[PDB]
Structure 1
Amino acid sequence: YRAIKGMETKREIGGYTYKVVFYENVFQDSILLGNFASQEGNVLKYENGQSCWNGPHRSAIVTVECGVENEIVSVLEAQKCEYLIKMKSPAACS
């Protein structure tokens, strides 16, 4: 997984610097969103992030689809401290 473990993509969204590191962790500024737990298809689950006022400990579901360059396409926090992150990356290509 070593051709992609540790690969980092960053994007500023809404003032936050989001940082996804494949098979390691996800951060929002200095806050841990989750550590890599499992993968099903293109979907990487990151779990057990930092505690959240009036919410769950943070987690992030990162969907990585084939593209020519690493990119964080969107971050959605529909439920408090549950992050849905869509990405493109050559890691997800044939």
Structure 2
Amino acid sequence: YRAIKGMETKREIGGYTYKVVFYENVFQDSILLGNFASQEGNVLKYENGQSCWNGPHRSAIVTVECGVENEIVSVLEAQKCEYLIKMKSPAACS
């Protein structure tokens, strides 16, 4: 279970372009979602993004699962500053 480091993965969701750059940072349109803090296997935690209320800054958990290509699958608001994003990648398979 790996994810391709250095690559930009971007996908439009809800009208906004989600962009995840592996081992760097994530953006939603132009908003800084989160910076990569820690990741295990194929599940990546990004936090300390752009300031939001009721949270310190944005954050998201990306779960990169088995897929054919590195694509953003879904982004669901977990709390408000934190979102659960599902992704797929061939390297996240086995």
Shift of 1:74: 0.3
Structure 2 gaps of 5+ residues are: none
In the TM superposition, structure 1's runs of 4+ consecutive aligned residues that sit over 3 Å from their partners are 53-56
Q: Residues 3 and 89 of structure 2 are in contact (CA less than 8 Å); yes or no, is this contact kept in structure 1? A: no
Partner of 2:69, secondary structure, is coil
- Match of 1:42? 42
Shift of 1:6: 1.2
User: How many pairs align?
Assistant: 94
Q: Residues 33 and 47 of structure 2 are in contact (CA less than 8 Å); yes or no, is this contact kept in structure 1? A: yes
| Alpha-carbon spacing, 1:2–1:39, altered in 2? closer, same or farther (3 Å) | closer
Q: Percent identity?
A: 100
Structure 1 gaps of 5+ residues are: none
TM-score, normalised to structure 2, is 0.87
TM-score, normalised to structure 1, is 0.87
Name the CA distance, whole Å, in 1 between partners of 2:80 and 2:29.
17
Shift of 1:88: 0.5
Q: Residues 2 and 41 of structure 2 are in contact (CA less than 8 Å); yes or no, is this contact kept in structure 1? A: no
| Alpha-carbon spacing, 1:78–1:4, altered in 2? closer, same or farther (3 Å) | closer
Shift of 1:3: 8.2
Name the CA distance, whole Å, in 2 between partners of 1:16 and 1:63.
19
Q: Which has the higher contact order (CA 8 A, sep 6+)?
A: 2
